[PDB]
Structures are given as C-alpha cells and as structure tokens.
Enzyme design. Structure first.
Site, short mmCIF file in Angstrom:
data_model
loop_
_atom_site.label_atom_id
_atom_site.label_comp_id
_atom_site.label_asym_id
_atom_site.label_seq_id
_atom_site.Cartn_x
_atom_site.Cartn_y
_atom_site.Cartn_z
N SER A 147 27.39 -28.47 5.95
CA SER A 147 26.87 -27.39 6.81
C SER A 147 27.59 -26.09 6.50
O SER A 147 28.73 -26.03 6.06
CB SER A 147 26.97 -27.71 8.25
N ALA A 154 29.24 -22.95 8.29
CA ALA A 154 29.83 -22.33 9.48
C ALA A 154 30.87 -21.30 9.04
O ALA A 154 31.56 -21.58 8.02
CB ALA A 154 30.53 -23.32 10.40
N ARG A 155 30.94 -20.14 9.65
CA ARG A 155 31.81 -19.10 9.16
C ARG A 155 33.30 -19.47 9.23
O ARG A 155 33.70 -20.21 10.13
CB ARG A 155 31.58 -17.81 9.93
N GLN A 189 26.79 -28.26 16.99
CA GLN A 189 26.71 -28.31 15.50
C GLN A 189 27.34 -29.61 15.01
O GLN A 189 28.28 -30.13 15.63
CB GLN A 189 27.40 -27.06 14.95
N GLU A 212 23.45 -35.08 4.45
CA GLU A 212 22.66 -34.07 3.71
C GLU A 212 22.56 -34.43 2.23
O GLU A 212 21.47 -34.17 1.66
CB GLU A 212 23.25 -32.66 3.85
N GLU A 232 27.59 -10.28 13.17
CA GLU A 232 26.87 -11.56 13.35
C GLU A 232 25.36 -11.33 13.07
O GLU A 232 24.85 -10.16 12.99
CB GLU A 232 27.17 -12.22 14.72
N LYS A 251 18.87 -30.16 19.55
CA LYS A 251 19.70 -29.32 18.71
C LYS A 251 18.89 -28.35 17.83
O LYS A 251 19.35 -27.21 17.59
CB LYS A 251 20.65 -30.15 17.87
C1 LIG Z 1 22.82 -19.49 6.48
C2 LIG Z 1 23.98 -19.39 7.44
C3 LIG Z 1 24.13 -20.36 8.45
C4 LIG Z 1 25.13 -20.24 9.45
C5 LIG Z 1 25.97 -19.21 9.33
C6 LIG Z 1 25.94 -18.23 8.30
C7 LIG Z 1 24.94 -18.33 7.35
C8 LIG Z 1 24.78 -17.39 6.14
C9 LIG Z 1 27.07 -17.18 8.32
C10 LIG Z 1 26.89 -15.91 7.49
C11 LIG Z 1 28.33 -17.88 7.79
C12 LIG Z 1 27.23 -16.72 9.75
C13 LIG Z 1 27.52 -17.84 10.56
O1 LIG Z 1 27.54 -17.43 11.98
N1 LIG Z 1 26.97 -19.07 10.32
C14 LIG Z 1 27.24 -20.15 11.21
C15 LIG Z 1 26.30 -21.21 11.34
N2 LIG Z 1 26.40 -22.23 12.13
C16 LIG Z 1 27.52 -22.34 12.87
O2 LIG Z 1 27.76 -23.33 13.57
N3 LIG Z 1 28.52 -21.39 12.74
C17 LIG Z 1 28.43 -20.27 11.90
O3 LIG Z 1 29.41 -19.54 11.83
N4 LIG Z 1 25.16 -21.14 10.52
C18 LIG Z 1 24.04 -22.00 10.86
C19 LIG Z 1 24.17 -23.44 10.50
O4 LIG Z 1 24.41 -23.56 9.08
C20 LIG Z 1 22.93 -24.26 10.86
O5 LIG Z 1 22.85 -24.22 12.29
C21 LIG Z 1 22.96 -25.69 10.35
O6 LIG Z 1 21.90 -26.40 10.95
C22 LIG Z 1 24.28 -26.37 10.66
O7 LIG Z 1 24.26 -27.69 9.98
P1 LIG Z 1 24.26 -29.05 10.84
O8 LIG Z 1 25.26 -28.90 11.95
O9 LIG Z 1 22.83 -29.19 11.36
O10 LIG Z 1 24.60 -30.10 9.79
O1 LIG Z 2 32.77 -18.74 26.57
C1 LIG Z 2 32.33 -17.62 26.60
O2 LIG Z 2 32.38 -16.90 27.78
C2 LIG Z 2 31.77 -17.04 25.34
C3 LIG Z 2 31.73 -17.76 24.04
C4 LIG Z 2 31.14 -16.94 23.13
C5 LIG Z 2 30.85 -17.10 21.72
C6 LIG Z 2 30.26 -16.04 21.04
C7 LIG Z 2 29.99 -14.79 21.69
C8 LIG Z 2 30.32 -14.55 23.03
C9 LIG Z 2 30.86 -15.65 23.76
N1 LIG Z 2 31.25 -15.70 25.12
O1 LIG Z 3 28.25 -15.49 12.85
C1 LIG Z 3 27.07 -15.73 13.13
O2 LIG Z 3 26.11 -14.89 12.80
C2 LIG Z 3 26.60 -17.04 13.68
C3 LIG Z 3 27.39 -17.91 14.33
C4 LIG Z 3 26.62 -19.15 14.59
C5 LIG Z 3 26.90 -20.34 15.18
C6 LIG Z 3 25.87 -21.27 15.25
C7 LIG Z 3 24.59 -21.02 14.68
C8 LIG Z 3 24.31 -19.83 14.07
C9 LIG Z 3 25.31 -18.88 13.99
N1 LIG Z 3 25.34 -17.64 13.48
K LIG Z 4 22.88 -29.12 7.73
MN LIG Z 5 23.86 -32.16 9.56
#
Ligand SMILES: Cc1cc2c3c(c1C)C(C)(C)C[C@@H](O)N3c1c(nc(O)[nH]c1=O)N2C[C@H](O)[C@H](O)[C@H](O)COP(=O)(O)O
Ligand SMILES: O=C(O)c1cc2ccccc2[nH]1
Ligand SMILES: O=C(O)c1cc2ccccc2[nH]1
Ligand SMILES: [K+]
Ligand SMILES: [Mn+2]
Ligand SMILES: Cc1cc2c3c(c1C)C(C)(C)C[C@@H](O)N3c1c(nc(O)[nH]c1=O)N2C[C@H](O)[C@H](O)[C@H](O)COP(=O)(O)O
Ligand SMILES: O=C(O)c1cc2ccccc2[nH]1
Ligand SMILES: O=C(O)c1cc2ccccc2[nH]1
Ligand SMILES: [K+]
Ligand SMILES: [K+]
Ligand SMILES: [K+]
Ligand SMILES: [Mn+2]
Lengths: 500, 500
Positions: free
Chosen positions: A167, A169-170, A187, A230, A279, A388
C-alpha cells in the site's frame, strides 16, 4: 523488461511517448523539484525527470515527478495510467478501471522468488546511510518534514504469514534512521499493525520499496479486499507472476527491479511528529502538530542511478486524484454489484476533489426492484459507507443511464438539476468519516464520524415507467438527419482535430 | 446609433468583431435555425445571422441566434454581453455586473418620446397578418408550439400608470392572432397582471418588442426592484434617455429602433395551452400539458429587413445562463449588502446550471460580527430566499475571500472541501421554489415550495481569528522568488498566448 513490470522501463516508455522532460541541470530538492512538478500537474504537462538533484550522492537519487498525472490531450489523457498497465495510451477510464478490477474473480498468481535483481546493485548498512543527508524533497513550503515517501509501496505481513499487504501511505524523515508516517484506520497497514500490537512481542517487519513495477503501485493505491495479498492480485491482472527478491535483514520480499528499498521495522510502541503535509484535497494547515507511526530503517538497497518517484500533491490534478479517487470508485462499483445493486459504472469526479463518487444506475433493473428513492438511497449508502472502499468518499451521486459518470460536466449537470436538496438526500452521521477532508478534521463536527450523504439524481419516473424527458441539447432535441446536415455544412456556412 | 442603444447597430458590431456568421442561403425555421444556434451555444462559436429564412415574407423576418452567448476565447469570453452595454469586449463578469447594478443608487433618467422611428417603417393591421404564416421557429423537436418570443421584451404598465415594466418571458404562437406564454409569480409581468385582474375592468394593454436596444434587453432580464420602471434604470445606466415611440393601437411606448413590435392585450380571463419548452436547465418533458396566459395581437409594426433575435436555450451555454443567472446573482449581491451582510461578489456558476449562487464573504467583516455558521447561514438564506431576486436560485454557497466566485472550478473546490454535508447546511422548505428546475416541478416534492439550501463553505476560523491554511497549489505553497524562477525557466527546461 516490460514498462508495466519495471519502473526503469516505464521511465523509458514515457520518454518514447514524448511524455517526459529530462532536466539535466542542478535542481534543488528543497521545494524546486516539487514546484516544477506542481506546475506540471496543474497544467497537464510532461512528467519531469530530475537527473541532477542537488544533494544526490553515490547514486541516491534522481526524481521522477507526476508519474500518474494527466496528459494535456483528450485522446491520451490517461496515458500515463495506461502505461502502468500495458494498455494502449488512448485507453479510457472505464478500460483502466476494468483492468484494475479484472483480477477480482481470477485465481491469484503468486509471486516468484528469484535470488537477486537490480535493487541489490548497491547497499548501505546501519553505519553507512543517514536519511537527513539524502536529497529528500521538501514538497510544500509549510510541510512538517521532508516527504521521502509519496509514491513507494509499504510491505507488511500479518503475524501468521498469510497476508502480505502492499500500500501507499505517506512518510517523512524523522532522523538519520527513522521515518514517521500515517498509519490510520481502516487502512490495511493499520489493520496489520494492530495485529502485531495485540500479539505484543515485536515491532512489525517492514520494507518500503520505491520505483516498483507500475502495475504494483496501482494495486498499492487500490482498496482491494481485506486479507488479499496484492502481489497475487497484480500477478493475475498482468497474467504474470511478479519476481521478488528477499530483503537482506528480514524475510519480506520486494520487487526485484525496485529502484530503492528501505528495510526495517514499524514500531508497535513508538510515535513521532508527522505532518503537516499538503494533502490530496488541496490544503495544508501549517503547524498542525500530529503524531504518527514511527519506522526504523536498518538497511537501504538500490539500483545504480536510482530514481525516486514523487507525487507533488494538492490541487488538481495529481496521483491523489487519478489513483486514489478512481481506484476507490472502481472498488465501490464492484462492491455495489456484489450487493445486488444495479450499478454499471462509478467514478470520483475531479471537480469534487475526488470526495464524491457518481454511480450510474441500470434503470431497467431499478424499475424491476419496485423501490423508492428513500429506500434505495439508504441501501446504497449502507453498503458503501459501512465498507472500507467507501472511506474516502463523502457524497454518492446516483444517476441514470443517460449520464457518463466519467464526464464531470455531466455529473454536475445531473446533480444540480435532478437532486432536490434535503428531500432527495440521506445523511449518514454514524459511519466512519475521512478526517483529511478539511470540513472533517478541521471542521465543525467530529473529525472521524459522519458527514456523509447519498444524493439521488434519479428522477421519479426512473423508478417506475422510464425516463420522461429529452435533453434540450443538440444531440437530443433535433432529429438525426438534421444533426448530420448541420455538421456536414458547418465549415461551408462559416463556423469552426481529435489527436491535437 | 450606438450598438448598446440600437439592435441593428449591435448586429453590425458583432460582424465588425468577427463574431457573426451571416448565412445567406435558405434555412428552415422548423428546427434548422435553432439546431445551428444550439451547436453555436454548445461550442461558444460565432453568432448566426439567418438572412434567408424559409417562410420570410414582406420583411418578416431574419433571425439572429445566440445574441448573449459566450465567445471561445478567455480574453473576450463575455464580449457579446459587453457589446450590450458599451463596455470593452474584454470586460470581466465583475465589470458587467457592476455596470448592471450602477443605476441602483442613481436618479432614473426617464425616456424621451419621439414622434416616429424605424419600428414604424412597416405595419400590418388585424386583417393583414397571421402569426401562423410567419417564419416562427420550432426551437426544440418536442416543443408544444413555435416560440416566437425568446428574446423580446414584454411591456405592461400598472393600472395607475406609475410603473412600466420591461421583462423577458417566453411565449409561443397559439393561433393567427394570439400567443400563449408564461406569466408566473413572483415575476413583475405576473404582479402587474394581478393588479389588472383585481381591478376587473379590462384586459392588460400590452406590447412585445423584439430587437430592442441591447442595454434594455439586459435590464429586461434582471430582477430590479418592484415598482421600478426599467426604462429609467437603463437611462441612468447608459447615461442617456431612451427614445420611445407610442404604439399605434394603445398608449404604451416602445423603443424607437425596435425591429418588430406586437401590440395588443394580455387577457385577465383567458388561458391556452403553453409548452412544453426546452428550458434553461437543459430539459423538455414532452407532452407536459400546462395552461398559460393568453395574449391577443392587434397590430404588428417592424423595421425594413427586420431581424428577430432568438435564444436556442437548454444545456450550456446560452442567454438563460449568461443573463438569467448572472443578473440574478448581481441583484442578490446588492440585496445582501443592503441587509448589512458582508458579501463582496456573487455569481451563479455555470456548472450548477445557474441553480447555485456563490457569495464571496469579506471575512474581516464577518469576524467582527462574532457569529456562527448556523446563525449566519440562516440570516443569509432568510434575506435571499424570501426575496424575488432569490427565486431562481436553490443553493447559496458561502465562500471566503480566497475564492474567485466567477471561477466555477474554485467554487466547486471550496464547496466540495469546506462544506460538511448536513452539518454545515441549512435547508429552507417554507420559501418559494422554482418549478422549472426538474427536481421541483417534475420531482418528489411540492413543485412551488422549498428545496432550497444554504451551504456554508466558510471554514471555522474564518468566523474567529482568520484563515488557518495555505493552499497546496503552485501559487501558495512556494515562495515568490522560486515561482518566478520556475516560470522564467519553463520553456528553457522543455515544458509548454493570452488572446488565442
Ligand atoms: C496514490 C496515493 C495513495 C495514498 C497516498 C498518496 C498517494 C500518491 C500520497 C501522495 C502519499 C498522499 C497520501 O496521503 N497517501 C496516503 C494514502 N493512504 C493512507 O492511508 N495514507 C496516506 O498517507 N493513500 C491511499 C491508499 O494508498 C489507498 O487508500 C489504498 O487503498 C491503501 O491500500 P490498502 O490499505 O487498501 O492495502
Ligand atoms: O483526531 C482528530 O481530531 C483529527 C485527526 C486528523 C487527521 C487529519 C486531519 C485532521 C485531523 N483531526
Ligand atoms: O496526505 C494525503 O493526501 C492523504 C492521506 C490519506 C490517508 C488515507 C487515504 C488517503 C489519504 N490521502
Ligand atoms: K492496496
Ligand atoms: Mn490491501
Ligand atoms: C434571458 C431570458 C430570461 C427569461 C427567459 C428567457 C431568456 C432568454 C427565455 C429563453 C425566453 C426562457 C424563458 O423561460 N424566460 C423566462 C423568464 N422569466 C419568466 O418569468 N418566464 C420565462 O419564460 N426569463 C427570466 C426573466 O427575464 C427574469 O427573471 C427577469 O428578472 C424578469 O423581469 P422582472 O419580472 O424582474 O421585471
Ligand atoms: O423557459 C425557461 O427556461 C424559463 C422559464 C422561467 C420562468 C421564470 C424565470 C426563469 C425562467 N426560465
Ligand atoms: O403546479 C405544478 O404542479 C407545476 C407547475 C410547473 C411549472 C413548470 C414545470 C413543472 C411544473 N409543475
Ligand atoms: K431525485
Ligand atoms: K426586468
Ligand atoms: K463549513
Ligand atoms: Mn421589473
């Protein structure tokens, strides 16, 4: 190696497509790389490849920005996504999403272990790297750290070994040998972290691989089901077993052609400062002071002349819109169909900052259900917002068969003209909310709960006897033979190419 | 005569602007003229002038389509509106709307009576015309009649003589000497009709003038206040007294340069079939069977080589969007400011099918009010939705000072990211609704009541201490000196004119 299976080949494909700008003069990772990339994303320009990054040493690293962003032309708008998947560059969104869903009723194709690969060309142990000394970008001027991780894949495995999740995640650099990052419910990285924390014995074995096979990074961005590995989903989608090498310092497996690999642990006990970060919805809240998960890095391995992909995310259009939104929409389409809902298509309009998903309804099937708006809205919202795959999406728009949900103008038209505010909507306050949306985490109500809605843009007769209007447009309000005459005589009369 | 004061001069101005296509070969008023015009409107092409209309006899009539529609270029997008008002063709929306509001705190300039004008070059009495024998267009294939009246001005006067109203309301041919049309509350033509009906003595003296001074048709489309005579408002806006001639068969006064004038009566007792009609929201409901007001025509006068303006209305973009939406928004802006609300700008986004108005808030002034979202939303909605200027508008979107409300992308961004569905909105069910919107008149609820909402896209700190974010965009997330460097080196590095 094919472009969809090897990031280095994908970069070449972009160059061959005349979809790359190679910058060979020095570029600063402090803001300049990301500013160029931001401009690219706002203007649908060619992807930038920064070959001369100030602070690059001993091969770490070049940057590719905007890897999954849009092209300017309508004809190949989604070509960079198509190049992640071996699709023609003229592929439609529907074709892309159908490719991403195709593995959902195929047998997995598990990965193949090979003894070595390009990702092992160079290594740095615990005494030889310092993550503060690498050319990690500052992506937005108010970010709370240098976000090394915007387009790599985290690899973690359930304690029992049965599920290996990939996955995005930043994550940002904390110190010489740690990252901090988002690990939040629902997630899969969070679900697996919770399994290790309940076991209580050890930190989570972890790897983060950058510049992975493009088809893998697409799955990494998609909410495929709980417990589904995956790697085997990507294998089935691509029709090929992915080649993986073992990590040096743990028993996880990374793609053999990964550009850069970090190996280490995700703590079950430690946290550190994380964010703020510019974001996906287009905002940063400077100074937010959150805590995030803490990762320890024990080893780095990398390709000669390694390339780090980077998403300079924010306002339209970047990977957070093209991938997060569209891939969630794809999953939602399938979820609805598995719940016997007559949904044919789903897309997250860019205009909504990918916070809406439009659901196209097969209204013949709806009519046979002999239901009402209130009942159908509640059913659709319960399915999607309790799952989800619905996490990131706060408004569902139901539309009939005349609307192309991949065309945001048409979604906006339908929403604005067919959904009576209040009466034609159902609010959901007792569902998980997405706190990253400003009106959630920085808004007037609970950051993590509610704020969701189903907006029914189906008209009343769509439930009963059928559509009872014609559009007041050129297509529908004139007969065929007249339309064709007008088009045939358009330039002759004095009025004003597909590829452009 | 100046273009803003004479329709014939306005047509020349469009030709001089390279904004006209003169079609000199035969064109059918049964659908073909309107199909060409529809295509123009959907593509922002040049206005069509149909000089050879099948069925034109003894000077009645040529057609000009798309008189108030958009141009393709960004630089002169609103140039045809600017040409209604003596403004430069590069005028912004703000400049157009400020011109239309300028007369609101000026003394009227009453009209000047002159003994004759071009509109008297030809006449046809009660024995010499037949409205079924004129080349009246069928505008949409399912229309319930031939809509002669889509861009003329109805002229009616209060019984006491004190208020003469000019307005656009649709009308179609009923028979050789009658029209039927919309006359609905709260419109001024309806208010004045009700005054005559309560008096009970006679039908309403009436005239309908086509091809009037452009500045007049703009006011005709604007909800200026009750009791205000549009002629004197246009006089003050333009700084010139408008020249009017008396009707032959009644004591109303029409613009001296009117292309075509119908004189007769609006019945206080009779009705006839009216509609359906392909309407401003983009729909027709074929077969709807409504009744409308009935007009008797006693006399036609017209210019040599008369030109009938026509709006081929429906899906974006035509006069029903550019004029109805924008001019209502202008009036709403003023209304809010007269009620001590800190609104700086207002616009009806095209993307909303002009059913929304975005209201830009001076948030410094908001902060000094020491109020809350719930209270401020309720105040704004009560002002606007209880007033006639709010009639057509079902959603108000409140936005802070960073948002350009004339840019629909930015309105959509703010709405989608800053307004929590439900919590940040107030519904209004006990206000007059606009039945023409499909979800009203063809929807699930009362056609004439409710279905309105105020959506607050102000963020919480905008009420208290000030904006607490920066946008994650090129403009806001990089310093000035970096931005300028990137722009200066953009083409040198390899990436890709105002007028286009
Ligand atoms: C394409 C893409 C996806 C994500 C993110 C980014 C990109 C480019 C960042 C630029 C890094 C910004 C970020 O906020 N970011 C991000 C994130 N999911 C999170 O939990 N936390 C994150 O920080 N996703 C989304 C997740 O990748 C999807 O929700 C995916 O479904 C997760 O996989 P899984 O848990 O289903 O296996
Ligand atoms: O727990 C909270 O109040 C809270 C979590 C969180 C995550 C991202 C942006 C704003 C947010 N607020
Ligand atoms: O940094 C962000 O844009 C971002 C955080 C995040 C967490 C969960 C799913 C999507 C997301 N996007
Ligand atoms: K995934
Ligand atoms: Mn998955
Ligand atoms: C620019 C424009 C305005 C209008 C219309 C059209 C155009 C092109 C039609 C194409 C003919 C379609 C039609 O539905 N139409 C229309 C109408 N108002 C109605 O009561 N009835 C109508 O049938 N308005 C709007 C009114 O002109 C404004 O609401 C104005 O404010 C009224 O003037 P007043 O009552 O404030 O004096
Ligand atoms: O025919 C239409 O588009 C239309 C009817 C109407 C009545 C009142 C205000 C605006 C209007 N537009
Ligand atoms: O009175 C009603 O039920 C009604 C009036 C009206 C006007 C326009 C469109 C639909 C409509 N329905
Ligand atoms: K509806
Ligand atoms: K008016
Ligand atoms: K809000
Ligand atoms: Mn009026």
């Amino acid at each position: 190696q094919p472009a969809h299976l090897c990031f280095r080949s994908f970069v070449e494909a972009l160059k061959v497509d005349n979809d790359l700008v190679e910058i060979n003069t020095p570029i600063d990772p402090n803001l300049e790389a990301a500013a160029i990339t931001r401009r690219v994303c706002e203007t649908n320009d060619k992807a930038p490849l920064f070959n001369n990054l100030i602070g690059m040493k001993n091969g770490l690293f070049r940057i590719l920005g905007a890897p999954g962003s849009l092209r300017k032309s309508s004809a190949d708008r989604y070509g960079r996504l198509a190049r992640h998947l071996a699709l023609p560059p003229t592929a439609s969104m529907r074709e892309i999403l159908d490719k991403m869903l195709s593995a959902s009723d195929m047998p997995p194709i598990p990965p193949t272990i090979v003894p070595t690969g390009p990702c092992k060309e160079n290594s740095l142990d615990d005494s030889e790297f310092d993550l503060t000394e690498l050319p990690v970008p500052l992506i937005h001027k108010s970010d709370g750290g240098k976000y090394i991780q915007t387009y790599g894949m985290h690899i973690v495995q359930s304690p029992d070994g049965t599920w290996t999740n990939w996955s995005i995640a930043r994550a940002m650099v904390h110190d010489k040998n740690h990252l901090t990052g988002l690990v939040i419910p629902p997630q899969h990285i969070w679900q697996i972290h919770q399994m290790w924390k309940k076991e209580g014995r050890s930190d989570v074995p972890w790897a983060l691989a950058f510049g992975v096979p493009p088809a893998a990074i697409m799955a990494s961005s998609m909410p495929i089901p709980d417990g589904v590995t995956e790697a085997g989903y990507v294998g089935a989608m691509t029709g090929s077993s992915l080649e993986l090498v073992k990590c040096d310092t743990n028993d996880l497996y990374v793609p053999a052609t990964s550009e850069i690999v970090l190996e280490g642990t995700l703590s079950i006990s430690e946290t550190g400062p994380e964010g703020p970060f510019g974001e996906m919805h287009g905002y940063i809240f400077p100074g937010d002071t959150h805590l995030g998960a803490k990762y320890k890095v024990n080893r780095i391995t990398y390709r000669n002349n390694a390339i780090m992909p980077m998403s300079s995310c924010g306002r339209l259009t970047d990977e957070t819109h093209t991938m997060i939104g569209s891939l969630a929409a794809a999953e939602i389409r399938k979820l609805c169909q598995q719940n016997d809902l007559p949904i044919t298509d789903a897309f997250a309009p860019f205009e909504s900052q990918v916070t809406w998903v439009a659901l196209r309804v097969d209204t013949e099937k709806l009519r046979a259900m002999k239901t009402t708006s209130e009942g159908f809205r509640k059913r659709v919202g319960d399915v999607v917002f309790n799952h989800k795959a619905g996490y990131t999406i706060h408004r569902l728009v139901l539309v009939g068969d005349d609307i192309d949900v991949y065309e945001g103008k048409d979604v906006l038209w339908a929403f604005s003209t067919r959904c009576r505010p209040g009466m034609d909507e159902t609010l959901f306050e007792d569902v998980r909310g997405f706190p990253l949306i400003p009106y959630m985490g920085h808004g007037n109500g609970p950051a993590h709960r509610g704020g969701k809605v189903v907006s029914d843009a189906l008209m009343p007769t769509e439930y009963t006897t059928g559509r009872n209007w014609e559009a007041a447009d050129f297509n529908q309000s004139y007969p065929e033979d007249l339309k064709q005459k007008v088009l045939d005589n358009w330039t002759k009369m004095g009025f004003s190419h597909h590829h452009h």
